């Protein structure tokens, strides 16, 4: 049934595809030690630099020991080869129910009581990562990497291994839907506040049911609006005055003017 193994043989690869990217292919896995299914994701190694390659060798060990209700479990990482393609396999907790992006497409408008519930859980996980020693910065938090455990269940934060491959200082092709980014990401100088900006945009997408800066055609058009202080058109479509007020304080142009995770958890909306 398998088409791969984890060298030590703790988990094996199957020929069942779930997700796809420009560098990633997600297949089903199975832990032999705990008899539980996992996510086998191959990452083409040839595309990765030596500077980012040695990071994976060090970051993975730290990600292994992390345990949190709102964090997708990281198990192992190693370099792999199939036929003539070099790759790196990330093995993580399997998420079958999907993401927030698929939920927002499936159910259009999201309810207020479930929005409060999930956003709090995102902040619970974000606080966890920042309170680690040394602190962990997500860098690339978006709606399609916040995974649901069920249709009613809690949310978990994923793509932690993929986070170091965000490549903000890198030039990428103009294809598909352009991704928004924090003002200080383009300069590689960032901290905890970069995840707050990402959260504010995530809550915006959860409330308005649409992708921010959709009026723009390319990423450069988004850059001009983000760096100058021009907010997305969807921001005005927020019905709830309280939710809009929280978003506004998270998507500030200056990183020093943004709310802290502590402030958002202590906020009246999140009880």
161 binds Br ion (CB under 5 A): yes
| Least spacing, CB of residue 104 vs Br ion, in Å | 22
Of the candidates 64, 65, 55, which has an alpha carbon nearest to the alpha carbon of residue 91?
A: 64
Candidate segments 16-24, 50-58, 87-95, 237-245, binder of Br ion by CB under 5 A: 87-95
By CB under 5 A, tell whether 200 contacts Br ion: no
Q: Of the two residues 71 and 226, which places its CB atom closer to Br ion in the complex?
A: 71
Is there binding between residue 77 and Br ion (CB under 5 A)? no
The annotation status of 270 as a binding-site residue, yes or no, is no
Closer residue to Br ion in complex, CB, 12/60: 60
Does the annotation flag 210 for ligand binding? no
The DSSP call for residue 267 is S
Tokens of 235: 């921001």
**94 lies in the site for Br ion, by CB under 5 A:** no
3-state SS, residue 19: strand
23 annotated to bind ligand: no
Per-residue tokens: 119: 């956003």
Q: Is 90 marked within a binding site?
A: yes
Judged by CB under 5 A, the stretch of 21-29, 88-96, 190-198, 202-210 that binds Br ion is 88-96
Burial profile 189-218: b = 16 or more Cβ within 10 angstroms, e = fewer = ebebbbbbbbbbbbbbbbbbeebbbeebee
CA gap 128, 229 in Å, rounded: 30
Closest approach, Cβ 36 to Br ion, in A, equals: 17
190 CB-near residues (< 8 Å, 6+ apart): 137, 139, 182, 184, 255
Encode burial over 226-247: b for 16+ CB neighbours within 10 A, e otherwise. beeeebbebbeebeeeebbebb
Min CB(181)–Br ion separation in Å: 20
Residue 208 interacting with Br ion (CB under 5 A)? no
131 annotated ligand-binding residue: no
Catalytic residues: 159
117 annotated ligand-binding residue: no
Measured from the CB atom, is 92 or 127 closer to Br ion?
Answer: 92
Pairwise CA distance, residues 30 & 40, whole Å: 9
70 scored as a contact of Br ion (CB under 5 A)? no
Q: Which is nearer to Br ion, 145 or 193 (CB)?
A: 145
Beta carbons within 8 Å of 235's beta carbon, 6+ residues apart:
204, 208, 212, 244, 247, 248, 251
Please identify, among the stretches 24-32, 121-129, 159-167, 252-260, the one whose residues bind Br ion according to the rule CB under 5 A.
Answer: 159-167
- Residue 140 beta carbon to Br ion: minimum distance, rounded to whole angstroms: 11
Task: Return the SS3 of 16.
Answer: strand
Interacting residue with Br ion among 92, 127, 193, 208 (CB under 5 A): 92
Question: Which positions make up the binding site for chloride?
Answer: 74, 90, 160, 162
Question: Which positions make up the binding site for ATP?
Answer: 22, 92-95, 142
List contacts with Br ion (CB under 5 A). Answer: 90, 92, 161
């Amino acid at each position: 049934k398998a088409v791969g193994m984890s060298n030590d043989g703790r988990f094996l690869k199957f020929d069942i595809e779930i997700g796809r990217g420009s560098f990633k292919t997600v297949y089903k896995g199975l832990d032999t030690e705990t008899t539980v299914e996992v996510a086998w994701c191959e990452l083409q190694d040839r595309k990765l630099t030596k500077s980012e390659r040695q990071r994976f060798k060090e970051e993975a060990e730290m990600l292994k020991g992390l345990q949190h209700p709102n964090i997708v479990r990281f198990y192992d990482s190693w370099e792999s080869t199939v036929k003539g393609k070099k790759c790196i396999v990330l093995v993580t907790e399997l998420m079958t129910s999907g993401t927030l992006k698929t939920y927002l497409k499936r159910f259009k408008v999201m309810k207020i009581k479930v929005l409060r519930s999930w956003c709090r859980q995102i902040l619970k996980g974000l606080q966890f990562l920042h309170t680690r020693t040394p602190p962990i910065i997500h860098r690339d938090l978006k709606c399609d990497n916040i995974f649901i455990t069920g249709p009613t269940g809690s949310v978990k934060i994923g793509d932690l291994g993929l986070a170091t491959l965000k490549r903000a200082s890198f030039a990428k092709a103009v294809i598909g839907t352009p991704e928004f980014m924090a003002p200080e990401m383009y300069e590689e100088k960032y901290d905890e506040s970069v995840d707050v900006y990402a959260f504010g945009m995530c809550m915006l997408e959860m409330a308005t049911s649409e992708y921010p800066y959709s009026e723009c055609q390319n990423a450069a058009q988004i850059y001009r609006r983000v760096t100058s202080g021009v907010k997305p058109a969807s921001f005005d479509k927020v019905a709830i005055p309280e939710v809009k007020e929280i978003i506004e304080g998270c998507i500030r142009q200056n990183k020093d003017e943004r709310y802290s995770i502590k402030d958002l958890l202590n906020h009246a909306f999140f009880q």
